[PDB]
């Protein structure tokens, strides 16, 4: 029962924290070459064991939450933002129930309603961009994504209350997701903390009103909000006003930053490979018609090249770079026994560009999925939405959203790099943002 190899700390307490913080990918890539798929190292006195490659990563994804726990690591950051009675503030079984309730809401019935809602929001927002110019796509996409997601996931009522004030409250909640948050004690009266806690109560209060309103209302509506109001547990109890508010927050936060960054990154991949962008525009005609009519849900499924362009983006710029668990009990993989207390980590980013399993691993060639490839070839080579009991329930809504917006965007504009600059990765944010993400655009044909 041998432990995995341990990369000895160069610095006593800090370990490899400095080195990791600059280029964590590069770090993990070197770590693989020199130590193999299973190894342990230290940052700020905490031991992490990393599982690189499908075979190893399998351990994390296959595991029960009893054994490799997600709350043990996530609870302290989420509970203060999402709120009580939801996500990691409850046993995993209760979460898995809440996940079904959320999942049911995300069906073909609602995906149809959404496409038109998202197309409309997309056209109306990109009025302000004029006929051409140079503007930050990321800033723009983030602002658009919150409105779409709120309209779609919350409803028109709650979407109608979305003034720039409420936008800044949603940012103040997101400020709750910081390196400071998990590095420093919660009892430090930090601005970011206090703005999170303030923004929480104020947003809960907004949802409390909108929920009461809907329940009283004779009004029957088939949207996600109602899915949750009507839904029940296995016991037969329905959700509380607070449980619902909690999940409405999680929904929006989940939706926004994952999609916005992903959307922003593609926009620069497409801006670099003009050949591919052209095909992506001509696909729109070829699938929807030469007249470019209002997008419908069933048209989405036929957008193979766009779908593959997204897939290829999440491969190279997955928004959630690392998923990690607390080891509660021993866990064996590749002849190694990970002891309790270790923080077991997996990297979609590393797994999705491993030289040994990826031909031309740095390249953005979305056609790599039209032959044998690790996505369909390997179990856990491709996991931008994860796997097992903690896997994403928002994979479909995400694609719907990213397709519709960019479908509408391609139709509206042609995009290009500025002096042939391609954004490098800014590792300083929680979700890695593109360094200087301003793009050149102009009216399409
Ligand atoms: O950094 C601390 N603890 C963790 C870090 N942490 C805690 C929560 N989140 C992060 C910590 C503490 C030590 C180590 C560590 C690991 C490996 C090493 F080789 C050395 C230290 C690793 C960690 Cl993670 C920390 C640990 C201990 C103290 C602390 N606790 N008690 C003391 C202390 C100080 C004193 F002046 C006296 C005494 C003391 N205690 C009992 N009786 C009489 C006494 F005088 C205790 O210091 C203050 C901070
Ligand atoms: O972004 C998170 N959760 C999201 C994930 N998401 C987004 C879309 N799909 C999944 C999240 C997860 C669930 C939900 C949600 C929404 C509605 C619901 F009804 C239910 C869930 C919403 C969101 Cl935004 C998230 C949750 C927890 C953490 C976290 N907590 N602790 C840490 C942490 C702790 C550490 F000790 C170290 C580190 C750490 N981080 C980077 N580098 C090195 C490190 F050591 C991070 O990270 C970080 C991120
Ligand atoms: C690009 C878009 C998205 C990506 C890449 C993404 C990625 C992920 C990943 C990797 C996980 C696994 C987390 C882990 O293993 O610890 C996850 C979990 C989850 N995601 Fe997403 N997600 C996206 C969008 C969404 C959306 C739109 C929603 C809801 C509307 C959502 C809701 C969730 C939920 C509820 C979980 C479960 C967390 C858990 O069980 O611990 N996600 N997502
Ligand atoms: C290692 C994480 C980054 C994790 C990530 O990249 O996702 C970062 C987040 C906070 C960073 C800490 C900030 C406080 C310190 C900043 C100093 O200038 C040198 C690094 C120190 C001692 C820490 C080192 C390390 O750089 C940390 C712990
Ligand atoms: C000791 C100073 C106070 C000195 C002063 O303010 O002049 C305090 C203030 C901020 C504290 C730092 C917080 C970041 C880090 C928290 C980690 O858990 C490991 C200890 C670190 C690396 C530092 C611990 C140390 O206790 C510091 C540096
Ligand atoms: C207590 C942790 C040490 C990290 C840890 O052990 O978890 C660190 C993080 C921030 C540190 C604080 C720094 C500012 C505070 C005033 C002084 O300028 C230093 C002492 C105080 C009252 C705190 C001292 C203490 O050392 C703290 C709270
Ligand atoms: C380091 C933590 C707080 C930061 C953290 O939670 O990480 C601080 C906050 C409360 C501090 C305790 C105060 C009571 C005690 C004070 C004594 O004179 C000797 C240390 C003791 C036993 C503890 C010292 C230690 O420094 C603690 C535990
Ligand atoms: C900040 C720490 C613990 C961390 C926290 O939860 O904030 C708090 C918790 C209990 C507090 C201690 C209790 C005895 C002391 C008198 C008060 O009866 C409370 C504050 C004093 C001065 C101590 C210092 C510090 O205020 C402590 C140790
Ligand atoms: C959080 C601890 C003790 C826990 C508590 O507040 O109950 C408190 C006790 C004393 C607090 C510090 C006192 C001076 C600082 C300015 C204010 O003149 C008082 C709060 C500030 C901002 C600091 C906040 C910091 O967090 C401390 C050290």
From Swiss-Prot:
Enzyme Commission number(s) from the entry: 1.14.14.154
GO MF term list: heme binding; iron ion binding; oxidoreductase activity; oxidoreductase activity, acting on paired donors, with incorporation or reduction of molecular oxygen, reduced flavin or flavoprotein as one donor, and incorporation of one atom of oxygen; sterol 14-demethylase activity
Pathway stated in the Swiss-Prot or TrEMBL entry: Steroid biosynthesis; zymosterol biosynthesis; zymosterol from lanosterol: step 1/6
UniProt cross-references to InterPro entries, sorted A to Z: CYP450_sterol_14alpha_dmase (IPR050529), Cyt_P450 (IPR001128), Cyt_P450_CS (IPR017972), Cyt_P450_E_grp-IV (IPR002403), Cyt_P450_sf (IPR036396)
Reported tissue expression: Ubiquitously expressed with highest levels in testis, ovary, adrenal, prostate, liver, kidney and lung.
Catalytic activity: a 14alpha-methyl steroid + 3 reduced [NADPH--hemoprotein reductase] + 3 O2 = a Delta(14) steroid + formate + 3 oxidized [NADPH--hemoprotein reductase] + 4 H2O + 4 H(+); lanosterol + 3 reduced [NADPH--hemoprotein reductase] + 3 O2 = 4,4-dimethyl-5alpha-cholesta-8,14,24-trien-3beta-ol + formate + 3 oxidized [NADPH--hemoprotein reductase] + 4 H2O + 4 H(+); 24,25-dihydrolanosterol + 3 reduced [NADPH--hemoprotein reductase] + 3 O2 = 4,4-dimethyl-8,14-cholestadien-3beta-ol + formate + 3 oxidized [NADPH--hemoprotein reductase] + 4 H2O + 4 H(+); a 14alpha-methyl steroid + reduced [NADPH--hemoprotein reductase] + O2 = a 14alpha-hydroxymethyl steroid + oxidized [NADPH--hemoprotein reductase] + H2O + H(+)
Top-level taxon: Eukaryota
Keyword Ubl conjugation belongs to the record: yes
Regulation of this protein's activity per its record: Inhibited by azalanstat. Inhibited by azole antifungal agents ketoconazole, itraconazole and fluconazole.
Cofactor: heme
EC main group: oxidoreductase
Protein name stated in the entry: Lanosterol 14-alpha demethylase
Post-translational note: Ubiquitinated by MARCHF6, leading to proteasomal degradation.
Recorded family membership: Belongs to the cytochrome P450 family.
One term under GO cellular component: membrane
Record GO biological process: cholesterol biosynthetic process; cholesterol biosynthetic process via 24,25-dihydrolanosterol; negative regulation of amyloid-beta clearance; negative regulation of protein catabolic process; negative regulation of protein secretion; steroid biosynthetic process; sterol metabolic process
Residues that, per the record, bind heme: 392
Topology in membrane: Single-pass membrane protein
Compartments (UniProt record): Endoplasmic reticulum membrane; Microsome membrane
Keyword set, alphabetical order: Cholesterol biosynthesis, Cholesterol metabolism, Endoplasmic reticulum, Heme, Iron, Lipid biosynthesis, Lipid metabolism, Membrane, Metal-binding, Microsome, Monooxygenase, Oxidoreductase, Steroid biosynthesis, Steroid metabolism, Sterol biosynthesis, Sterol metabolism, Transmembrane, Transmembrane helix, Ubl conjugation
Known role: Sterol 14alpha-demethylase that plays a critical role in the cholesterol biosynthesis pathway, being cholesterol the major sterol component in mammalian membranes as well as a precursor for bile acid and steroid hormone synthesis.
UniProt-listed Gene3D superfamilies: Cytochrome P450
């Amino acid at each position: 029962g041998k432990l995995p190899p341990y990369i000895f700390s160069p610095i006593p307490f800090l370990g490899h924290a400095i080195a990791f913080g600059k280029s964590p990918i590069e770090f993990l890539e070197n770590a693989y070459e020199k130590y193999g798929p299973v190894f342990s190292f230290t940052m700020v006195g905490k031991t992490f064991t990393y599982l690189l490659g499908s075979d190893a990563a399998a351990l994390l994804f296959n595991s029960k939450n009893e054994d490799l726990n997600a709350e043990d690591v996530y609870s302290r950051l989420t509970t203060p933002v999402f709120g009580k009675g939801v996500a990691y503030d409850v046993p995993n079984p209760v979460f898995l129930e809440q996940k079904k309730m959320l999942k049911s809401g995300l069906n073909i019935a609602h995906f149809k309603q959404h496409v038109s809602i998202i197309e409309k929001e997309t056209k109306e927002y990109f009025e302000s961009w004029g006929e051409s110019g140079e503007k930050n796509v990321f800033e723009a996409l983030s602002e658009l994504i919150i409105l779409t997601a709120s309209h779609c996931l919350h409803g028109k009522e709650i979407r109608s209350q979305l003034n720039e004030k409420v936008a800044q409250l949603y940012a103040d909640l997101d400020g709750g997701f910081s390196h400071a948050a998990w590095l420093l004690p919660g009892w430090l009266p930090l601005p970011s903390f206090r703005r999170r806690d303030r923004a929480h109560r104020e947003i809960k209060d907004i949802f409390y009103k909108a929920i009461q309103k809907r329940r009283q209302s004779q009004e029957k509506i088939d949207d996600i909000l109602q899915t949750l109001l009507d839904a029940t547990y296995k016991d037969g109890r329905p959700l509380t006003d607070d449980e619902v508010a909690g999940m409405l927050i999680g929904l929006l936060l989940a939706g926004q930053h994952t999609s916005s960054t992903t959307s922003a990154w593609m926009g620069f991949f497409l801006a670099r490979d003009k050949t591919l962008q052209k095909k992506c525009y001509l696909e729109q005609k070829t699938v929807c018609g030469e007249n470019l009519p209002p997008l419908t849900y069933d048209q989405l499924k036929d957008l193979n090249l766009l779908d593959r362009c997204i897939k290829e983006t999440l491969r190279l710029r997955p928004p959630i770079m690392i998923m990690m668990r607390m080891a509660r009990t021993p866990q064996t993989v590749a002849g190694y026994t990970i002891p309790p207390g270790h923080q077991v980590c997996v990297s979609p980013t590393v797994n999705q560009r491993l030289k040994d399993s990826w031909v031309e691993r740095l390249d953005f060639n979305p056609d790599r999925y039209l032959q044998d490839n690790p996505a369909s070839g390997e179990k856990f080579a491709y996991v931008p939405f994860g796997a097992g009991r903690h896997r994403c329930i928002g994979e479909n809504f995400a694609y719907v959203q990213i397709k519709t917006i960019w479908s509408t965007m391609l139709r509206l504009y042609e995009f290009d790099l500025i002096d042939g600059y391609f954004p490098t990765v800014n590792y300083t944010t929680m979700i890695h943002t593109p360094e200087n993400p301003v793009i050149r655009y102009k009216r399409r044909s």
